[PDB]
Design a binder for this molecule. Structure first.
Ligand SMILES: *[C@@H]1O[C@H](CO)[C@@H](O)[C@H](O)[C@H]1NC(C)=O
Ligand SMILES: [Cl-]
Lengths: 233, 209
């Protein structure tokens, strides 16, 4: 995947144009760059599976991988190692950086890729096989559960629709809260970027069912939560 | 009217008969007014790996979003459309007069051309998805000697993609949209469902027993 980073592309081009001329037989340059480019290209060849690899990374992981690669590569070119020894360690370095990259990607997968344990999260990602950056839909569950809230009289009712992943998700709109009546209808109470609804100084009549609906440009909610509120005199 | 109109296939998750559905999820919304799919089913049609089928679209990794979208629509169309009547057949090679599927549902050019264009730079490893997959780790994975390459490589034309992904549930019709002789797998709801008239035409057009 690291070849999707411009710094790496640049380092390979300097390696071919600047470094090889004085550090390798001319009759070798064409065949050598073929092999190098193929070995970098091969950073994308990780065993496809969830919690390990799905053909994508986010930008941070690409950067981390790119940084590690470039530092290792520079250590070689800074040293002016020539000929047969240069080739051996270039490729052994590549082989070792690929495993180091896999290490970063596996962490990405386990921790960063579709973090949401519910709802639908929009996440920007880079596709390792084509270097295209696009937004992906992480669909976990149709709704994100129910809540039971106890709220004494004269006390403030607070319904929190925030979820740890909301901040990071992309293309979020406005939390919308609804009051859900015994009929088959509901009424809107508030919409806005307030991730919480508050009704001050609750009375017995405020008890009932509410519901938050965090909107998305996808035009299908990112988060649906149902609150069951009881007022306990 | 006609016995091949407004029916659902005797299949897995399909409803007995089509009926409206207040809330249908995302891509499967155009069939809201009259649908052989349920809500649950329409959600499940949007999943990473869908519980509706044993199949993984992400065998070479994630499809690009705009490619994935076409596959979810094909699935919506397949699970929700009450206009497939004329192409409903028994499962297995054999005639009616002797468990159901659909066979050769004619998709318009544009539906297949758009699908192919948006899937151009997504990745797969097989030019025919019905067959030699490896299932040794639960879901289907790419065979030993089969490189992940662009859809434009394994599915050289739009017809190949329409046909070879889903066992000829679909055929890539030479006809274009608003010919009255092919179905769209998706349509903007604002305008009407253009497939109603197409089913009507084939139900009474196919000289059959
Ligand atoms: C039914 O909807 C009406 C709308 O005005 C509302 O006033 C009423 O509270 C609802 N039913 C009940 C008894 O909750
Ligand atoms: Cl239809």
């Amino acid at each position: 995947c690291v070849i999707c980073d411009p710094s790496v592309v640049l380092a390979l081009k300097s390696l071919e144009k600047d470094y090889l001329p004085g550090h390798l037989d001319a009759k070798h340059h064409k065949a050598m760059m073929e092999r190098v480019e193929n070995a970098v290209k091969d950073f994308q060849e990780l065993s496809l599976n969830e919690d390990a690899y799905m053909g994508v990374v986010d930008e941070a992981t690409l950067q981390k991988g790119s940084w590690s690669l470039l530092k290792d590569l520079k250590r070689i070119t800074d040293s002016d190692v020539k000929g047969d020894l240069f080739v051996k360690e270039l490729f052994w370095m590549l082989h070792l950086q690929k495993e180091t990259f896999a290490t970063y990607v596996a962490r990405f997968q386990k921790e960063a890729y579709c973090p949401n344990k519910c709802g639908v999260m929009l996440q920007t990602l880079i596709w390792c096989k084509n270097c295209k950056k696009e937004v992906h839909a992480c669909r976990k569950s149709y709704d994100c559960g129910e809540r039971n809230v106890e709220v004494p009289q004269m006390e403030d009712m607070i319904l929190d629709c925030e979820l740890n992943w909301h901040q990071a998700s992309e293309g979020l709109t406005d939390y919308s809260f609804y009051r859900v009546w015994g009929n088959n209808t509901e009424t809107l109470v508030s919409k806005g970027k307030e991730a919480t609804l508050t009704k001050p100084m609750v009375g017995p009549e405020d008890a009932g069912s509410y519901r938050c609906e965090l909107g998305s440009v996808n035009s299908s909610p990112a988060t649906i939560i149902n609150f069951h509120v009881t007022v306990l005199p | 009217g006609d016995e091949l109109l407004n029916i659902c296939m005797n299949a897995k998750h399909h409803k007995r008969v089509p009926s409206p559905e207040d809330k249908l999820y995302e891509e499967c919304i155009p069939w809201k007014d009259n649908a052989c799919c349920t809500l649950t089913t329409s959600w499940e049609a949007h999943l990473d790996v869908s519980p509706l089928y044993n199949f993984s679209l992400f065998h070479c990794g994630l499809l690009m979003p705009g490619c994935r979208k076409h596959f979810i629509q094909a699935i919506c169309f397949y699970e929700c459309s009450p206009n497939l009547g004329p192409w409903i057949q028994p499962v297995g090679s054999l005639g009616w007069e002797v468990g159901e599927r659909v066979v050769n549902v004619p998709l318009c050019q544009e539906d297949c051309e758009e699908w192919w264009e948006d899937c151009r730079m997504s990745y797969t490893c097989k030019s025919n998805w019905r067959g030699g997959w490896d299932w040794s780790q639960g879901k289907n994975r790419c065979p030993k000697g089969a490189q992940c390459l662009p859809f434009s490589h394994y599915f050289p034309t739009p017809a190949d993609l329409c046909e070879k992904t889903w066992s000829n549930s679909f055929k890539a019709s030479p006809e274009r949209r608003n010919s009255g002789r092919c179905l769209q797998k998706w349509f903007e709801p604002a305008q009407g469902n253009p497939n109603v008239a197409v089913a009507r035409l084939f139900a009474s057009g196919r000289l059959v027993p």
